[PDB]
Amino acid sequence: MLKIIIPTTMLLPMTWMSKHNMIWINATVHSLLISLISLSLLNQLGENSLNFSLTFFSDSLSAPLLVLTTWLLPLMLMASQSHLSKETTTRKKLYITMLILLQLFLIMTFTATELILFYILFEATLVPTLIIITRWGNQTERLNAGLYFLFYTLAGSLPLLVALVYIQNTTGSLNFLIIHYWSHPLSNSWSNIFMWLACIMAFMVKMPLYGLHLWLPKAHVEAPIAGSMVLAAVLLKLGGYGMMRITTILNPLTNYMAYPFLMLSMWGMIMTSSICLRQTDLKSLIAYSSVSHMALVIVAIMIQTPWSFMGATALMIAHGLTSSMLFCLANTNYERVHSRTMILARGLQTLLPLMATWWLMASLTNLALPPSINLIGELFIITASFSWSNITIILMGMNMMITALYSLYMLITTQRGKYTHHINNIKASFTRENALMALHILPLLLLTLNPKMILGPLY
């Protein structure tokens, strides 16, 4: 891991001392180089996770998610040198400083060998993000969005902190391994129930949650594009990654005290998907779409089934790559039309042929048609839910309805139809935009050949 953590830090002195206009070029190429180094962690033994040292260890869950972060860093850097090149060098250099620091916390968080060690940097990702939304955002409501995002996740993080230190005072160290091997069946006492809520609400408030999803429309829509990918692609998985890591000392209390959360997520995703079917903002439709998929992940964890986790990891990384790509789609129009209303810029296939295509397989991948790992993600969860309860498919499949209508509805409204008459600013798609988007979908299709890597620790 030191083979990744140190190089990730080393970009920061380099970017801060690179030449005036070499900042993006130099940073991108080594950022791609680091992701190449991070590809080394895909190998996992048929047994205990790769434990490099007491400081850091990686399993078959962290490694697929880790590579997503490292592969991501070129994508924001390559998605941001168009809406920031008009700013001064120091502020541009500071933007790289936040992004590099944001990655470093993610790398350390996903690889933390100690539960409390996980907690610090997993929470510490707030500071680099909160700067991104509030400083470089491009709307007025970004400030209230920053408060909404920061406070909403902090309201759950603190009870987790009290819960984690309590487990320390009662069971000793919270090392992930010793926790797994030293497991005590949780009683149905009232205190254990409240301990269960503290150890869970911090992660469950973080993906979306139906009722706790109000920060995504504020944050994702108002965030800068480089940031906007991160609030939906990777940090939502931090709330995810915590769930499968923490749901090993809560069994069997999670067996019973999960119906209110399972019930909220199952019905909630139908509601929020229905929001997408009747949304006005392109980014908000994408963000609310991320809510429905992420709520599906929330459902998946709470049965504690080998098939459920097996498709849970695949769904998260598949969704994260897609949601980033769709947020690239919103950016492409946003530079030209300078507005986010959907019906403002209809008729893009006639004007931009390839960008229409890039919007095409992006929509199908969100459609979760086979064999794209979005399908292998959802379909695995369906069987796990179905075995848990047969009525689930009625609620399960009904989501597949709405996720079909709004996905093409976003496509049909924007790309197809007559082009907008009064616009005359749409130029040919920059090779940066097309190349970036190919670097999103192509590995996503390339992953389809062997999803054995992305399947997760249960496999």
Partner: protein, 57 residues
Amino acid sequence: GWVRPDLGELSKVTKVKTDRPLPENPYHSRARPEPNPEAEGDLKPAKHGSRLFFWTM
């Protein structure tokens, strides 16, 4: 056959040859609490470092 004592002799601290033995404990002191045993042994290094959360050393 007496004599006036000059200044100082009557203020002199003088011993007296007596019979009564020294009291065993004039204050009538009770038994003392046993002091807690003192530390002993070479000051060995702390086992496995600080042992404060994830800090290895």
